[PDB]
Amino acid sequence: GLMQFTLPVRLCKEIELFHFDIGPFENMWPGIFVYMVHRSCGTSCFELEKLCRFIMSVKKNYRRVPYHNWKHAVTVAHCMYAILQNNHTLFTDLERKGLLIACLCHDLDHRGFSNSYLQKFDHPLAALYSTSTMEQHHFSQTVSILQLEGHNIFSTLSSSEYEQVLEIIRKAIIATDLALYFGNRKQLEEMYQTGSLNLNNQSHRDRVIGLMMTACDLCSVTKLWPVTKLTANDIYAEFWAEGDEMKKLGIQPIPMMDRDKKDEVPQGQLGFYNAVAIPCYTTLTQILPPTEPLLKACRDNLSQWEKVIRGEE
Ligand SMILES: Cc1cccc(Nc2ncc(-c3cccnc3)c3cccnc23)n1
Numbered sequence: 444g445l446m447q448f449t450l451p452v453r454l455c456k457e458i459e460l461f462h463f464d465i466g467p468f469e470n471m472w473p474g475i476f477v478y479m480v481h482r483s484c485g486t487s488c489f490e491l492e493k494l495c496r497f498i499m500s501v502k503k504n505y506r507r508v509p510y511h512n513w514k515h516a517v518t519v520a521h522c523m524y525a526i527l528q529n530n531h532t533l534f535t536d537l538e539r540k541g542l543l544i545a546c547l548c549h550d551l552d553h554r555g556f557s558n559s560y561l562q563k564f565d566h567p568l569a570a571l572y573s574t575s576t577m578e579q580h581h582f583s584q585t586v587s588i589l590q591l592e593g594h595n596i597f598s599t600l601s602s603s604e605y606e607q608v609l610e611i612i613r614k615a616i617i618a619t620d621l622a623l624y625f626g627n628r629k630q631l632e633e634m635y636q637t638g639s640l641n642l643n644n645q646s647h648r649d650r651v652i653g654l655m656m657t658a659c660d661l662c663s664v665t666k667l668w669p670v671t672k673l674t675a676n677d678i679y680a681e682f683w684a685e686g687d688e689m690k691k692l693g694i695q696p697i698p699m700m701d702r703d704k705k706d707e708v709p710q711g712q713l714g715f716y717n718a719v720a721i722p723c724y725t726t727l728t729q730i731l732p733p734t735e736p737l738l739k740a741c742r743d744n745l746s747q748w749e750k751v752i753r754g755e756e
């Protein structure tokens with residue numbers, strides 16, 4: 444009950460900042476997550492015994508893939524923590540509980556392959572879930588772990604509160620399907636500009652939470668350049684493996700996934716920042732002004748990729 448998690452001074456301070464890197468010490472990541480839950484939600488919103496058992500079962504169900512791994516899970520949860528802490532009064536108690544857990548669970552049992560590859564392979568999951576294939580699987584895996592004995596961290600919620608939080612988690616995880624992001628941001632952009640955006644409108648909150656999930660999911664583009672540059676390697680290690688597997692199915696992959704077209708990565712990143720990341724954090728900053736540091740860091744990284752192209756690194 445009176446058991447706080449405390450971090451070393453440097454982590455205690457830097458964890459509050461959007462550009463925090465959770466570090467290479469895997470065994471500190473569970474504690475970093477509990478620290479964030481306690482400060483974001485309260486020392487009381489989860490039974491520590493059940494939370495710790497939930498965290499370790501979630502960890503076990505992430506795979507040893509270069510990017511879509513346990514470190515990504517905790518990194519995405521931290522970005523959500525920074526958004527929630529900088530927008531204290533805008534989110535309900537249930538939302539704060541739901542979203543940190545949604546972020547931790549959002550890529551559960553990822554194999555390092557896109558929805559497109561599953562469909563072209565004809566993976567069983569592509570028959571079970573025709574769209575947002577991996578994302579429906581991630582939510583399914585979340586519910587499965589919540590239903591392990593001693594793993595239901597929501598046990599002390601009322602029946603209606605329980606249905607609400609599982610609904611928040613389901614929408615949040617589905618929203619991490621980047622195919623759904625483009626239309627979601629366009630709608631949010633229209634609503635902000637015409638002035639129809641209303642956070643008391645549940646369908647509008649859903650859209651804003653969706654964008655927050657995209658923003659947290661892409662947050663490797665909001666780190667200091669050395670973190671962004673080195674994480675880029677990990678995402679491209681997966682892309683190139685998927686490209687190899689496309690060639691094994693007799694299909695030329697998109698250049699992004701072709702390890703023979705490694706030369707084209709810098710220009711591929713410009714496209715990604717301009718088409719996905721910058722628009723995402725711009726719309727997020729308009730809706731939630733205190734998330735501006737994510738947009739600023741993203742612009743800095745765009746400028747670093749421009750310097751790579753100009754041979755200045
Ligand atoms: C349209 C297009 C072209 C090329 C690439 C791309 N996808 C991504 N590229 C890079 C990152 C990334 C990760 C970590 C650090 N820095 C960058 C990333 C992260 C998440 C999802 N997608 C991507 N999309």
Ligand SMILES: [Mg+2]
Pocket residue numbers: 549550577619620
């Ligand atoms: Mg995902």
Ligand SMILES: [Zn+2]
Pocket residue numbers: 515519549550619660
């Ligand atoms: Zn993710």
